[PDB]
Scaffold this active site. Structure first.
Site, short mmCIF file in Angstrom:
data_model
loop_
_atom_site.label_atom_id
_atom_site.label_comp_id
_atom_site.label_asym_id
_atom_site.label_seq_id
_atom_site.Cartn_x
_atom_site.Cartn_y
_atom_site.Cartn_z
N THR A 63 34.30 -30.08 13.36
CA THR A 63 34.86 -29.05 12.48
C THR A 63 33.95 -27.82 12.52
O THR A 63 32.75 -27.95 12.70
CB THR A 63 35.00 -29.56 11.03
OG1 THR A 63 35.24 -28.46 10.16
CG2 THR A 63 33.73 -30.25 10.57
N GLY A 64 34.52 -26.63 12.36
CA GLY A 64 33.71 -25.42 12.38
C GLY A 64 34.38 -24.31 13.16
O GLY A 64 35.61 -24.21 13.18
N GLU A 65 33.58 -23.47 13.81
CA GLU A 65 34.13 -22.41 14.65
C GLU A 65 34.89 -22.96 15.87
O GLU A 65 34.28 -23.47 16.83
CB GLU A 65 33.03 -21.44 15.07
CG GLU A 65 32.51 -20.61 13.93
CD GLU A 65 31.39 -19.68 14.34
OE1 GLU A 65 30.80 -19.86 15.43
OE2 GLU A 65 31.10 -18.76 13.55
N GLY A 66 36.22 -22.84 15.84
CA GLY A 66 37.07 -23.26 16.93
C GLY A 66 36.58 -22.79 18.28
O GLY A 66 36.53 -23.58 19.22
N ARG A 125 48.78 -19.33 16.68
CA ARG A 125 47.38 -19.47 17.06
C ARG A 125 46.95 -20.93 16.95
O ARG A 125 47.19 -21.58 15.92
CB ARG A 125 46.51 -18.49 16.28
CG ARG A 125 46.49 -17.03 16.87
CD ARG A 125 47.87 -16.30 16.99
NE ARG A 125 47.75 -14.89 17.43
CZ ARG A 125 48.78 -14.05 17.63
NH1 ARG A 125 50.04 -14.43 17.41
NH2 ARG A 125 48.53 -12.80 18.02
N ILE A 126 46.32 -21.46 18.00
CA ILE A 126 45.97 -22.89 18.05
C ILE A 126 44.46 -22.98 18.13
O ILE A 126 43.82 -22.29 18.95
CB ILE A 126 46.63 -23.58 19.27
CG1 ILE A 126 48.15 -23.59 19.12
CG2 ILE A 126 46.08 -25.01 19.48
CD1 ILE A 126 48.90 -24.21 20.32
N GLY A 127 43.88 -23.79 17.25
CA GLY A 127 42.45 -24.01 17.22
C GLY A 127 41.97 -25.25 17.96
O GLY A 127 42.66 -25.80 18.83
N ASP A 128 40.76 -25.71 17.60
CA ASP A 128 40.14 -26.86 18.26
C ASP A 128 40.66 -28.20 17.76
O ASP A 128 40.51 -29.20 18.45
CB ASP A 128 38.63 -26.81 18.01
CG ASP A 128 38.31 -26.94 16.54
OD1 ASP A 128 38.52 -25.96 15.80
OD2 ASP A 128 37.87 -28.04 16.11
N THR A 160 40.11 -28.10 7.84
CA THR A 160 39.99 -29.21 8.79
C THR A 160 39.44 -30.43 8.03
O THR A 160 38.50 -30.31 7.22
CB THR A 160 39.05 -28.83 9.94
OG1 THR A 160 39.55 -27.65 10.56
CG2 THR A 160 39.01 -29.92 10.97
#
Ligand SMILES: [K+]
Ligand SMILES: [K+]
Ligand SMILES: [K+]
Ligand code: NA
Ligand code: NA
Ligand code: NA
Ligand code: NA
Lengths: 131, 155, 158, 131
Positions: free
Chosen positions: A51-54, A29-32, A1
């Site tokens: 940024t980080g854990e979705g 798979r879709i993140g934040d 990211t």
């Protein structure tokens, strides 16, 4: 990211976030990062990139939260970033960068490090990885 | 109160990250920050600055976006991005990109040129082509380093 | 307080809505509401209730979801859904579904059974099959009424 | 778009939204329904499902906003829904349904009509399309 937040001389704020996502993710798979209000948010008052854990960023709508805490609690940019990072993440590990329409810049993160760089027209300039 | 800018290349960095890589990362961050600083000094709009800076971050293979992206379990790349302009809260987002060189610029085009705010996978690839942006084989985005890391990821 | 529930079948209703369709819509809303009330009176957890009620709304062809969904320009159906459990803010979401009979239940499985919170398109279709949910041909979701309206929407786009 | 929000006797809230999206859409277009914080949100104090113009619901993080206004402005559910519909939607048209952890239920919308039905354990029940 990766991401960038900017406030220009006209006081306009903008934000952009881009990613390859999580290593070894299954297809689809879709993140934040592409989710407005989670990975990315800008409004009259600030621009924010997370940024980080979705999981944590999505569930806490983290980018919008910086803006909400400015708008509704009245906090200035640095306080708002502190508040979100310290008190709106618990399980999760994340970081964010932000600008305010008044020309402030902030970064906050609760994990070990975060690649970032910040600058203001008045000459402030900083590049860092750790705290 | 004047212009201001931050860039990031991701949170959560390995504490055993070697000095040379630390410097490389700081050097990239600085190059990208300086690109943005120059634009702001030239009175380029905030929305144009975030896009130009993120394009440089995407292009460089160091961080996890564009070329240099992390790999799926099949060892291929699927990219995603979003962008937002503050004054009118205008939004654009893209997911499932496999041939588009600069995902942030496709998100910009979704914002500016689509009735929708988010396009993904096959439809986003069609949109890229309707808009005439640069597209390339997925292998373009795969770097040796990430191939190695994926192997570690799978144990 | 005690339990509370709301259901919806979308905004954007034209004021010239025919009485007959108004009645169908109220009857469906009532059936779905009462289905949720029955589960709530039986001490079913909130997260299970919203899933069971949206499944009924998906299955009935009247509103725009599941069978009876709006059509893409290609004349086919691409469905999406999300679900969220409040106490621990657990999320699941799916997009780009073309064969999954009940999208909301696949969103539930993303929440409970994926390390991710959102899966879409080909990977979501793969996940449905790993999870063993009911899958059908896309034509299943397409109704005459929606084919009719797609025609109109297209030409209207001049 | 269809949806349901529930608070159970344990005070747990949940929210679900499902849709076929916009008629004549091109493949790959994603609206607000599957986006946490936009079409759907639930937390300790509420569950929310939104419906209407995706554009407006996304940029206004509408489902998260009900919760943010309850949390940060201290508004109770009915007034928070009023606030979000009035102040958070501009030219955009949308509506939402919501429940609170205290067992209230609300719906609000700024367009001509919205298919909804609402009920509480004490016996309130309404099925409505218009104002
Ligand atoms: K990169
Ligand atoms: K339906
Ligand atoms: K999960
Ligand atoms: Na890159
Ligand atoms: Na657009
Ligand atoms: Na249906
Ligand atoms: Na999950």
């Amino acid at each position: 990211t990766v991401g960038c937040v900017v406030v220009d001389r006209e006081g306009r704020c903008a934000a952009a976030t881009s990613t390859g996502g999580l290593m070894n993710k299954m297809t689809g798979r879709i993140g934040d990062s592409p989710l407005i209000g989670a990975g990315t948010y800008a409004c009259d008052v600030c621009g924010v990139s997370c940024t980080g854990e979705g999981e944590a960023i999505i569930r806490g709508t983290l980018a919008r939260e910086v803006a909400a805490v400015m708008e509704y609690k009245g906090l200035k940019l640095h306080q708002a970033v502190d508040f979100v990072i310290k008190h709106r993440l618990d399980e999760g590990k994340a970081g964010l960068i932000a600008v305010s329409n008044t020309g402030e810049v902030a970064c906050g993160f609760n994990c070990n490090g975060m690649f970032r760089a910040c600058a203001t027209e008045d000459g402030f300039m900083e590049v860092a990885i750790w705290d | 109160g004047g212009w201001a800018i931050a860039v990031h290349g991701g949170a959560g960095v390995d504490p055993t990250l070697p000095l040379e890589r630390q410097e490389e990362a700081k050097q990239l961050l600085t190059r990208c920050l300086n690109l943005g600083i120059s634009a702001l000094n030239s009175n380029v709009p905030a929305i144009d600055v975030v896009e130009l800076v993120v394009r440089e971050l995407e292009t460089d293979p160091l961080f996890n976006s564009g070329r240099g992206s992390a790999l799926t379990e099949k060892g291929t790349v699927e990219m995603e991005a979003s962008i937002m302009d503050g004054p009118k809260r205008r939004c654009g987002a893209v997911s499932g990109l496999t041939t588009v060189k600069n995902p942030i610029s496709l998100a910009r085009l979704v914002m500016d040129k689509s009735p929708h705010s988010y396009i993904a996978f096959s439809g986003a690839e069609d949109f890229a082509r309707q808009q005439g942006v640069e597209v390339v084989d997925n292998e373009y985005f795969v770097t040796p380093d990430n191939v190695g890391m994926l192997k570690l990821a799978k144990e």
